[PDB]
């Protein structure tokens, strides 16, 4: 069974200066496999915390996670206006990779292409231009996110050999490929449906990009 990550609380209110502590609940131990993310309206997930307590480069000191096995918690100590955003947790234990549904607080580059209208039944094919790091050393992940809902992870690939992992739910409806030449990753959607229109965003260790928005209309 999938690893269901529970944050019990859509909305959270706070002031500035204020402390505020969000979890997320496991619903299997995945040992101190844990990150944290913040993301803004309009914007990719920024990276928070790793390995359940690490802090990523260039995180404010406000923000400390803790947490093993199957509760982790994300505190910011003193609230600025700027962390009011969403927040979200995600394992990276075992596959497939999954997030926690969100929680309302109120020089590697990866550049997306490719989203646009596309006609129901028909494909499309996004691709994600990577740059500043080698690009055969770092599994680039690929991520769907409906407007206004969650993250839900479709799959990854590495660059070197294009070794590809595939949540079941996409296993046919998309494909992951790579072209070292260039330095680009592509992934292919077949049989669009409303289903499938949303922002997709490809993703390395520490850094997303930032997003590319398909329409089936």
């Known amino acids: 069974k999938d690893i269901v990550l529970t944050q019990s609380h859509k909305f959270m209110s706070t002031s500035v200066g204020d402390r505020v502590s969000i979890t997320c609940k496991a619903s299997?131990?995945?040992?101190?496999?844990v990150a944290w993310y913040q993301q803004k309206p309009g914007q990719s997930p920024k990276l928070l915390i790793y390995?359940?307590?690490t802090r990523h480069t260039g995180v404010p000191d406000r923000f400390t996670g803790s947490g093993s096995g199957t509760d982790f918690t994300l505190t910011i100590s003193n609230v600025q206006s700027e962390d009011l955003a969403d927040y979200f947790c995600?394992?990276?234990?075992?596959?497939?990779?999954?997030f926690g549904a969100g929680t309302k607080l109120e020089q590697v580059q990866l550049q997306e292409s490719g989203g646009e209208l596309v006609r129901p039944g028909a494909s499309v094919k996004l691709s994600c231009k990577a740059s500043?790091?080698?690009?055969?050393?770092?599994?680039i992940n690929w991520v769907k996110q409906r407007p206004g809902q969650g993250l839900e992870w479709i799959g990854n690939?590495?660059?070197?050999?294009?070794?590809?992992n595939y949540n079941q739910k996409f296993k046919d409806k998309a494909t992951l490929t790579v072209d070292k030449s260039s330095s680009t990753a592509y992934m292919q959607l077949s049989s669009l449906t409303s289903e499938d229109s949303a922002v997709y965003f490809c993703?390395?260790?520490?850094?997303w990009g930032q997003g590319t928005l398909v329409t089936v209309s």
């Open positions: 993703a390395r260790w520490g850094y």
């Open positions: 500043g790091y080698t690009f055969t050393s770092y599994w």
């Open positions: 690939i590495y660059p070197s050999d294009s070794y590809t």
């Open positions: 299997q131990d995945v040992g101190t496999a």
């Open positions: 390995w359940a307590s």
């Open positions: 995600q394992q990276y234990s075992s596959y497939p990779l999954t």
